Design an enzyme around this catalytic site. Sequence first.
Site, mmCIF file in Angstrom:
data_model
loop_
_atom_site.group_PDB
_atom_site.id
_atom_site.type_symbol
_atom_site.label_atom_id
_atom_site.label_comp_id
_atom_site.label_asym_id
_atom_site.label_seq_id
_atom_site.Cartn_x
_atom_site.Cartn_y
_atom_site.Cartn_z
ATOM 1 C CG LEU A 98 -2.039 -1.079 1.393
ATOM 2 C CD1 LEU A 98 -3.020 -0.615 2.460
ATOM 3 C CD2 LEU A 98 -2.800 -1.492 0.139
ATOM 4 N N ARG B 286 4.952 3.183 0.841
ATOM 5 C CA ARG B 286 6.407 2.952 0.767
ATOM 6 C C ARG B 286 7.177 3.805 1.775
ATOM 7 N N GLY C 174 9.443 2.429 6.637
ATOM 8 C CA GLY C 174 8.318 1.561 6.980
ATOM 9 C C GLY C 174 7.324 1.377 5.843
ATOM 10 C CB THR C 175 6.856 -1.331 3.414
ATOM 11 O OG1 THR C 175 8.084 -0.868 2.851
ATOM 12 C CG2 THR C 175 5.902 -1.720 2.291
ATOM 13 C CB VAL C 176 1.538 0.492 5.171
ATOM 14 C CG1 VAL C 176 0.194 -0.026 5.676
ATOM 15 C CG2 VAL C 176 2.163 1.416 6.211
ATOM 16 C CE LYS D 78 4.772 2.284 10.849
ATOM 17 N NZ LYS D 78 4.314 3.252 11.885
ATOM 18 C CG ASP E 164 5.662 12.087 13.908
ATOM 19 O OD1 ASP E 164 5.617 13.248 13.430
ATOM 20 O OD2 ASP E 164 6.019 11.095 13.231
#
Lengths: 277, 285
Positions: free
Chosen positions: B21, B23, B24-26, B41, B134
Amino acid sequence: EAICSALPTIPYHKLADLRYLSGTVSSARHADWRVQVAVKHLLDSERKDVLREAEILHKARFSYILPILGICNEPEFLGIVTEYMPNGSLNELLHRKTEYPDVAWPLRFRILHEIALGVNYLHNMTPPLLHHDLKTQNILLDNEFHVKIADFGLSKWRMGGTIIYMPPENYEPSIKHDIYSYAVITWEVLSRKQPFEDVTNPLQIMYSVSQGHRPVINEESLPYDIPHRARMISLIESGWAQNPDERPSFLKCLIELEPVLRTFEEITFLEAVIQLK
Amino acid sequence: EAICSALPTIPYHKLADLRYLSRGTVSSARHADWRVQVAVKHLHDSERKDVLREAEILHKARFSYILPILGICNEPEFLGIVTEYMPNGSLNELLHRKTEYPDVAWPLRFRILHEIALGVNYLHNMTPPLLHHDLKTQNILLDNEFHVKIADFGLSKWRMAPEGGTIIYMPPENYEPGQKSSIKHDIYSYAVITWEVLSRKQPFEDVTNPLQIMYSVSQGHRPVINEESLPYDIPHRARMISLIESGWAQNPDERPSFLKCLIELEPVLRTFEEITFLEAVIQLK
Ligand SMILES: [Ca+2]
């Protein structure tokens, strides 16, 4: 990596606006968190029951299980604190016909799917958790009528009230109990009728069920316009089978439901909900 | 005395239908045994401890408006966090995809702001308090009915290489971090989020260079509060601007707690009938 979460302790003075509802269930508002909550609250060994239940709910956290927000444990007061469920139980939805004249099929199917997803999760825990007290009364409905399974009082780890959801092999004291209750719930959901209407004594129900009789399946109880009728009837019939060995696992039951749920467009679920009171 | 809940470990091979989904890649997936969709994640032994830290925070911070963690996927060949799948994406996409969402009803925007505040408030009231540090519209996730789930606890801290990201939600005093940074970071971020929700505008839209923003902000410039950004027809406009302006004060000490914000928002939300939230969601479908 033995990652652990602790259930918060809530001071009784934090539960503002305590009001009676229907154990004794009361509503409140948390003074610090600013959310409406529900509280379930004498004895000395009845304390071990409450702590045990709170531990079960805390361990079984999942999308379709009632979320526990904390325990109120004091000499003065003992209670389980959970998210408030504004829309009550499935029992009220199916039976309060003047309050809810129309409960559209997509929503009924969604409820049936979510109940199964929840129990399946419990059965897949390690070790398996068996609910053992499923009834329309214990399936709670959140703000958008999504399911939260509650009441883990009779639940067990695999290591006197209404008996309509109890499999017959249980009258003379199994992993096949929940699916039986699920089959009765499904019949109840699809018919909006009380199982065994014409029966004046619960011993007559117990006797009939022990002889293999079940809630009635015909055109009056389950009308011909029920989407996927034949398929639902087979599921109901296999779920409440006399021989518990022939009842399906929740995995199999979900594999059967999945293609049924895909036939409803997402927006129809939303429209079913908005139509409600 | 304490009642403990352990976070399940999920074998990688139980995650069927893995699809990229972000690009940490989900990634999205379905759990083979639980039969639900999930979000994963993961990375593209030290970047490992970061993941375990976040997983632990999500697990301890469970609450109605915080993204639920379903488990940890921890193996030699794969490491990842498994959370509930959020079918409606992020608040960022709802605010800025104007073609997909020409209208976002006021009652829904207010419920979102109310739920964010409830979420952060809960974190701030833990023992010891958890500070997100954050917050952004990109990290406010929306479920099937557009209820809020706060995500991304990567920079979060218990109050006891650099990755490229926007600085628009960061308070000026955090630009050169010290030992004191601070319980007043989150409120600043919320204030910018509030402005962005009520305006559907990119903060500091005019300024093309991120470094210029940092100068302006230290020199006191904030996102523009006028008619073109916050129209006069906005429900409870004056009271919201007052909330925003105090929330992003140059001096951290003047900024309010979340509890205070809640007290201010509770009466506003009571002016919207329940039905309007459902209508707003149907409108977005
Ligand atoms: Ca649209």
